[PDB]
Amino acid sequence: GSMLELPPVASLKGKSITSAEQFSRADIYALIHLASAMQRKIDAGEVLNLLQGRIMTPLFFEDSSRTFSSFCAAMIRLGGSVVNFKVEASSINKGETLADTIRTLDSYSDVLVMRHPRQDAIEEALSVAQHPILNAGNGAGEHPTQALLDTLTIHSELGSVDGITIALIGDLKMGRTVHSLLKLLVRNFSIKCVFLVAPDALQMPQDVLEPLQHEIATKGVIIHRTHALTDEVMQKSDVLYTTRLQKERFDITIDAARMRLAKEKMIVMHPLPRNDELSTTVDADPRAAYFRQMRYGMFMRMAILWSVLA
Amino acid sequence: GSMLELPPVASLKGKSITSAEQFSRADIYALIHLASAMQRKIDAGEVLNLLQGRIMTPLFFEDSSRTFSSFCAAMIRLGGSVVNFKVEASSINKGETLADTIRTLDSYSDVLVMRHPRQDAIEEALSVAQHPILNAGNGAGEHPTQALLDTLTIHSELGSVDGITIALIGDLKMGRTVHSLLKLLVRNFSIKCVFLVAPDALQMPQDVLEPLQHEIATKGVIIHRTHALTDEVMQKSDVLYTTRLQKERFDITIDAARMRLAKEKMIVMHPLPRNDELSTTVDADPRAAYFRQMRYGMFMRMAILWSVLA
Amino acid sequence: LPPVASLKGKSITSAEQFSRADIYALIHLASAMQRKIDAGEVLNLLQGRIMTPLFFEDSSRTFSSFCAAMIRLGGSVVNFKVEASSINKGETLADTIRTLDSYSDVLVMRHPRQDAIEEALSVAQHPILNAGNGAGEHPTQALLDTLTIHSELGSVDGITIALIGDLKMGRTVHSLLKLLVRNFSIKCVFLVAPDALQMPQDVLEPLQHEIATKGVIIHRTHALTDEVMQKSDVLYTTRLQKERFMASTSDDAAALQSFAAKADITIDAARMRLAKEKMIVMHPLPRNDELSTTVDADPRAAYFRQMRYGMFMRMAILWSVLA
Ligand SMILES: O=C(O)C[C@H](NC(=O)CP(=O)(O)O)C(=O)O
Ligand SMILES: O=C(O)C[C@H](NC(=O)CP(=O)(O)O)C(=O)O
Ligand SMILES: O=C(O)C[C@H](NC(=O)CP(=O)(O)O)C(=O)O
């Protein structure tokens, strides 16, 4: 992969990432191609030195395994460095405010990666930070880089995004992942059909669906609400994207039996982590893409960091 | 051409840093000049490779945001590395002593950065370590690199340290920052006047004032106590250095209204974190330098690290 | 700095997986790495490679020396912390392994459960290095301990070694006894512990063939007798593993008390007056009161230098695994 170019995505340069609404179809494709080239070079064992002497600081005010780790790994694999700031042993225990904490890490860093239980926390950070801030999850609001890596996953597994039927399953109300993903998909691609599969209490919120109505209508995107993985859903979906019940903010299980109803050419996705909604019996199935999904996330996050800091 | 552009301060080579007392006026000017050269290169986007293959290990037995992070960032910006040792998950929980803990990190590292709630813990660490130890705060004692970066901030903001009138405000008793700062300023500069602004119970300790007796007399420094931030203090001070009540170790509030009495040209400083003593209404004021102070912190710690390890 | 080829791309689980030739090639590579680092040389061997530590229980030396080792090879570290991870959202151990496996070149794993490493092995593609699995094994400890003996005394064959303290729960002495006996011609091993904390059968029995055919003497005592002090070339002593005895049961109370009450195993300056001239005192660390600070000034106290040999052995290991 040594002869592949790594052109940064210019429209991302020096900008904070807060929403899936920020990106055009052309940004996304260009991030996909960049991530793909990142993957090729890293897998061939090539050493990248694009971000030498640039610092990423993670500001994680809630738990994370994948998002924290992929961002760190992505930064390192670009030749960058990470300052390992941790909230629990910080000067917040001395009474420091969220705003002063952002200002503090912003003094040392080239980019901040921020996750916070309050939906409004990243606007607050944005209002005081000089350097780009990447939204790693703002309460039940959004998770725009998950959306990007999820789309990368779809494109690499199935070969296209236009024309798919996708089921978003589980806690759609509190799932910031499915908020960002639906936005990113409906705004930039010709989705055929979206199954919104959730108990009534946990349906996709109105504040996500409504701003999309113009695009849903002009592109003819079919939106179908269910409360179960019916036979129809199992048989038409090219992607089953399922989610964890977001317990910390307070049928639909996929197992191998349920999987014998699925199409030959489809993928099962989950942003992770999972509880019982997604059975380990599915893990050996080639259509299980939720592990590969995590590796795609590192390479997308490399495409993003390089584009922001180039 | 490092030895022209970033000459290390030779006097610091291979030595621990424990007190503001160990530095001459010439050391401080050499560090300031090296620090602002660090700043010039980093701000222009130049990558430093001075300390590749060298390791800094933080040993923080109390909370920190600024001191930990700026040391980690400074190390990284010099091309060096950090081993992220955390006290809370260490073999101290198996009953290891402080001395054994120090020998352990001393075995792997080139330099240790230590913050500890006990005043004598730095001297206990020195009696066993082979490599330099940088005192990042020892109980209510001293914070010597804070005094260095505070002095860089004064010099860079105002142009001069000789001849200033400075107010040290808040919890002067337990304020390890004002202990070191007063030492550093009075031993090496001809300060016109110091205001110590605190009720008697939180006044500057006698063990700080007494040993400065010779310098106070020889340079004719004026020193007054007040119990409040009076109009006279407001109108005469070039530097308002304010501090947090160190609650964990047991009117003077600056706000926009009080700032209406300040000189047109002066700075408000605070080593941070702040509580109610320094109102956010001050933040927009050009004289508010307590955010820029954090960034000088990084560059001073670059100058220090490079000098210790060159 | 030639990598030891047998280690390439392989997980490290047990002291049993190494040959004599493996051990000497690691020793020589470790000592070659020490030469260069001490001379101030910078190594770029693993630039762009990532090590992720997965520690589910406490560590100072193993965690820090793996990180430092990785760094001094030019490699990098992703500082994954269990306490603030998605484990709190209910993620299983398996799914945790697969997660960090997606980003890393090698995982260094310590877990209070003996079978956890094997479970990690069954899901991960990249090599896993056992940094301690319960009271089970600590394979890189045994390797660095052997480097220490070799560097300090000059030779491993022919030694008399006392293994002292909590031998029941001591994963270090488990790995070390296997490594030594499988691959060296040991003259004598003193198993010095109270009965309640003696070396387990599941360690000794698989070694019995080698013990017998090599004619290795095994002597059990519950004290540091004159005989042990005068004969031993190495006194390898251990901490009582209190955390393996947190049940509040009578079985646990008896085991915990026996360390001091049913044995006489403290090493202090007075005791060291009985030791030979050419020998070393070792301890994987951390220590409590079983190894007195009055021994620290003795040239025969090797337990601090042992930590430094540890960093160099771990460099030789990481480089050999990842080359
Ligand atoms: O938490 C979830 O279930 C989904 C989603 N998960 C992630 O981003 C992965 P992690 O929490 O491991 O970073 C999130 O919004 O945090
Ligand atoms: O804590 C204070 O208020 C003053 C001073 N503050 C600092 O050093 C900044 P930090 O605690 O963020 O490193 C200290 O002595 O800790
Ligand atoms: O814990 C002991 O007493 C011996 C042994 N110690 C070590 O490995 C050193 P550590 O805990 O510092 O990494 C262990 O098995 O953890």
Side-chain angles (χ1 to χ4, degrees), chain C residues 9 50 63 124 147 153 158 162 165 169 185 220-221 230 235 242 273 298 309:
Chain C
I50 291 184
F63 171 88
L147 168 63
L153 299 181
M169 301 294 182
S185 170
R220 298 177 194 217
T221 75
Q230 300 173 338
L235 301 182
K242 289 170 177 279
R273 296 171 87 262
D298 201 307
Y309 292 122

XYZ file of all heavy atoms in Angstrom, chain C residues 9 50 63 124 147 153 158 162 165 169 185 220-221 230 235 242 273 298 309:
146
model
N 5.463 -13.744 17.144
C 4.008 -13.831 17.029
C 3.337 -14.754 18.046
O 2.176 -15.151 17.874
N 1.821 -1.114 18.979
C 1.084 -0.739 20.159
C 0.909 -1.891 21.153
O 0.503 -2.990 20.788
C -0.296 -0.174 19.813
C -0.176 1.193 19.126
C -1.197 -0.108 21.105
C -1.540 1.825 18.846
N 3.466 -3.747 35.293
C 2.883 -2.711 34.471
C 3.934 -1.712 33.984
O 4.032 -1.449 32.780
C 1.740 -1.994 35.197
C 1.240 -0.784 34.479
C 0.228 -0.900 33.523
C 1.778 0.466 34.741
C -0.263 0.207 32.859
C 1.304 1.606 34.055
C 0.265 1.469 33.119
N -8.521 -13.844 21.016
C -7.638 -12.806 20.505
C -6.727 -13.308 19.359
O -6.212 -14.436 19.407
C -6.789 -12.241 21.659
N 17.583 -14.208 34.302
C 18.551 -13.176 33.865
C 19.349 -12.617 35.071
O 20.587 -12.551 35.008
C 17.870 -12.034 33.085
C 18.681 -10.754 32.808
C 19.901 -11.034 31.918
C 17.836 -9.608 32.170
N 25.525 -13.923 39.475
C 26.356 -15.046 39.945
C 27.255 -15.625 38.844
O 28.315 -16.205 39.123
C 25.474 -16.138 40.548
C 24.650 -15.693 41.774
C 23.812 -16.832 42.334
C 25.537 -15.125 42.859
N 24.064 -25.764 38.543
C 24.792 -26.051 39.775
C 24.390 -25.270 41.018
O 24.908 -25.555 42.100
N 16.973 -21.301 47.586
C 15.860 -21.429 48.529
C 14.700 -20.630 47.967
O 14.862 -19.461 47.624
C 16.241 -20.895 49.922
N 8.739 -18.438 51.622
C 7.583 -17.613 51.988
C 6.268 -18.273 51.632
O 6.017 -19.395 52.025
N 0.523 -19.567 47.102
C -0.090 -18.554 46.237
C 0.897 -17.743 45.397
O 0.497 -16.859 44.640
C -0.927 -17.616 47.119
C -2.014 -18.347 47.885
S -3.242 -19.013 46.727
C -4.409 -19.751 47.861
N 20.484 -27.531 35.315
C 20.972 -28.583 36.226
C 21.145 -27.984 37.615
O 22.229 -27.531 37.991
C 22.299 -29.185 35.717
O 22.902 -30.042 36.695
N 12.378 -29.671 52.097
C 11.377 -28.784 52.690
C 11.752 -28.430 54.119
O 12.119 -29.316 54.900
C 10.001 -29.427 52.697
C 9.463 -29.746 51.332
C 8.120 -30.446 51.430
N 7.755 -31.050 50.147
C 6.515 -31.100 49.662
N 5.497 -30.570 50.352
N 6.293 -31.683 48.484
N 11.698 -27.140 54.452
C 11.873 -26.710 55.830
C 10.830 -25.643 56.069
O 10.238 -25.121 55.116
C 13.246 -26.066 56.092
O 13.272 -24.741 55.531
C 14.381 -26.883 55.489
N 23.792 -21.196 54.799
C 25.183 -21.486 54.418
C 25.313 -22.125 53.032
O 26.322 -21.916 52.344
C 25.880 -22.352 55.495
C 25.916 -21.652 56.883
C 26.441 -22.533 58.028
O 26.424 -23.773 57.958
N 26.905 -21.882 59.097
N 18.789 -16.722 47.782
C 17.654 -16.747 48.675
C 16.598 -15.945 47.956
O 16.719 -14.723 47.824
C 17.991 -16.135 50.036
C 19.129 -16.788 50.832
C 19.307 -16.092 52.209
C 18.855 -18.265 50.996
N -1.804 -11.992 50.720
C -3.020 -11.739 51.513
C -4.298 -11.684 50.685
O -5.354 -12.107 51.150
C -2.894 -10.421 52.295
C -1.904 -10.430 53.478
C -1.697 -8.987 54.019
C -0.768 -8.950 55.244
N -1.469 -9.315 56.529
N 24.445 -12.585 58.196
C 25.761 -12.939 58.724
C 26.013 -14.438 58.569
O 27.151 -14.878 58.637
C 25.881 -12.521 60.198
C 25.811 -10.985 60.415
C 25.713 -10.601 61.896
N 27.031 -10.485 62.500
C 27.633 -11.433 63.224
N 27.027 -12.603 63.473
N 28.853 -11.203 63.710
N 23.465 -4.218 51.713
C 24.308 -5.357 51.388
C 24.532 -5.477 49.876
O 23.581 -5.398 49.104
C 23.669 -6.634 51.947
C 24.664 -7.751 52.117
O 25.368 -8.080 51.135
O 24.752 -8.298 53.242
N 16.867 -5.386 35.650
C 16.967 -6.586 34.762
C 15.605 -6.925 34.156
O 15.509 -7.334 32.990
C 17.494 -7.818 35.517
C 18.944 -7.720 35.954
C 19.289 -7.842 37.298
C 19.983 -7.526 35.012
C 20.628 -7.768 37.714
C 21.314 -7.439 35.413
C 21.630 -7.572 36.772
O 22.953 -7.488 37.195
